[PDB]
Amino acid sequence: EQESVKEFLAKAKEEFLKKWESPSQNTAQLDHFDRIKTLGTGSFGRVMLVKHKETGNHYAMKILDKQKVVKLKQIEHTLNEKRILQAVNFPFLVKLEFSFKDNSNLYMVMEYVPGGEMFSHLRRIGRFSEPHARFYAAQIVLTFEYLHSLDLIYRDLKPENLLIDQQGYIQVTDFGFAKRVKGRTWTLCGTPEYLAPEIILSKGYNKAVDWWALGVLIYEMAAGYPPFFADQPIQIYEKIVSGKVRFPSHFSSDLKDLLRNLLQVDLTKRFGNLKNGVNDIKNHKWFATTDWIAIYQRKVEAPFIPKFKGPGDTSNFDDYEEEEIRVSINEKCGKEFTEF
Numbered sequence: 631e632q633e634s635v636k637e638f639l640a641k642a643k644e645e646f647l648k649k650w651e652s653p654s655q656n657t658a659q660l661d662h663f664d665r666i667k668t669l670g671t672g673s674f675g676r677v678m679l680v681k682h683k684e685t686g687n688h689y690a691m692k693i694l695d696k697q698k699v700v701k702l703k704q705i706e707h708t709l710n711e712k713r714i715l716q717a718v719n720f721p722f723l724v725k726l727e728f729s730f731k732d733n734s735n736l737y738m739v740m741e742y743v744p745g746g747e748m749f750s751h752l753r754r755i756g757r758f759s760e761p762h763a764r765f766y767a768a769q770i771v772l773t774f775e776y777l778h779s780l781d782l783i784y785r786d787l788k789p790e791n792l793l794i795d796q797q798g799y800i801q802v803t804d805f806g807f808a809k810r811v812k813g814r815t816w817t818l819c820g821t822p823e824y825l826a827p828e829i830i831l832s833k834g835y836n837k838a839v840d841w842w843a844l845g846v847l848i849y850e851m852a853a854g855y856p857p858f859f860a861d862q863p864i865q866i867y868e869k870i871v872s873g874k875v876r877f878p879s880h881f882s883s884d885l886k887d888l889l890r891n892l893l894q895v896d897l898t899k900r901f902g903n904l905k906n907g908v909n910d911i912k913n914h915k916w917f918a919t920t921d922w923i924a925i926y927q928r929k930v931e932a933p934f935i936p937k938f939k940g941p942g943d944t945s946n947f948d949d950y951e952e953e954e955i956r957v958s959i960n961e962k963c964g965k966e967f968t969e970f
C-alpha cells in the first residue's frame with residue numbers, strides 16, 4: 631500500500647483511539663431542541679427531526695427507550711453505537727453532534743441529511759446504472775477501509791442506512807450493530823437479505839461479513855433487487871448458504887466477476903479478506919475508472935442531487951404517527967447505561 635494510505639490510516643487510528651478511550655458524554659439536553667417530525671420508528675427507538683432553539687440548526691435525533699433496549703437485549707449494542715460514533719471521523723459517516731440521556735431515554739443527535747435514503751431513490755428509479763452504483767460503492771469501500779482499520783465491523787449495510795446528502799454523496803447512518811472487534815464476534819444481527827453465510831451458520835465471524843454485504847448492496851443497486859431474494863427468511867437463508875447466484879444479462883462481465891468474489895461463500899476466499907485486503911477490490915477492473923482520492927475529497931460530480939428545498943425539508947422521508955417523548959419522573963435502568 632502507498633505510504634500515503636498507511637500514514638493516513640495511522641493518523642485516523644490515533645485520533646479514533648484518543649476519543650475511544652475518553653468518550654464524550656452529556657453534551658446537550660432535550661429542552662435545547664424543538665421537535666419537528668418523526669422520520670422513522672422501530673421496536674426500541676425513533677428518529678426525530680429537531681431544531682436547536684438557539685442556533686436554528688436541524689438535527690436527526692435518535693431516541694432510544696432504555697426499558698425497551700433492555701427487553702430486546704440491545705444494551706451493549708446501544709453502548710457500542712454511541713461510543714463508536716463519538717470517536718469516528720470520515721467524510722461518508724453521519725456525524726454525531728451531541729449525546730445525552732435522561733430518566734427514560736438515550737439520545738444521539740446527528741447531522742440531518744435531507745436527501746432521503748438510498749433505498750427510496752433506488753425503488754423510485756428501479757435500478758442504478760453501473761457508473762451510478764459504482765460511485766456509491768466506492769464510498770462504501772473507502773468507509774469500510776477506514777472502519778476496518780480501526781478494528782470496527784459495521785454489520786448493517788443495506789440501502790435504508792445510506793442517506794444521500796446535499797451534494798449527492800452517501801452518509802452512512804445507524805451504527806446500532808457496529809462493534810470494535812479484534813478477531814471474531816458471534817452475535818446474530820443484520821437484515822436477512824444482507825447476512826453472510828457465516829452469520830447464518832452461527833460461526834465466529836469477522837470483517838469479511840461487511841465485504842459480503844457490499845456484494846449484496848452492489849448487486850441490489852445494479853439489478854433493483856437483491857441476489858438472494860425469496861418470500862420468507864428461511865428461504866433467503868437457504869439461497870445465501872447455497873453458493874449459487876444468478877446475474878441479469880445486462881450486468882457487465884467485470885461486475886459479475888467482482889460480485890462472485892464478494893459473494894464468495896468461503897470467507898477465506900472472499901475479496902476484502904485476502905492477503906491484499908481492500909486492494910483486491912480497489913484494483914478490480916470494475917473500479918478501473920474510479921479515482922479513489924477524488925471520491926474521498928468529494929470532487930467527483932454525483933449521479934444526482936436529491937430534490938429538497940432546504941435543510942429542514944422532510945419531503946424525502948415518510949410519514950409516521952407522532953407519539954410523545956415522555957420522560958419518567960423516576961430514573962430507569964441507570965446502572966445499565968452508566969457509561970452512555
Ligand SMILES: O=C(Nc1cccc2ncccc12)c1cccnc1
Pocket residue numbers: 669670677690692724740741742743744793803804805806947
Ligand atoms: O441515526 C439515524 N439516522 C439519521 C442520521 C443522520 C441524519 C438523518 N437524516 C435523516 C433521517 C435519518 C438520519 C438512524 C436511522 C435509523 C436507525 N438508526 C439510526
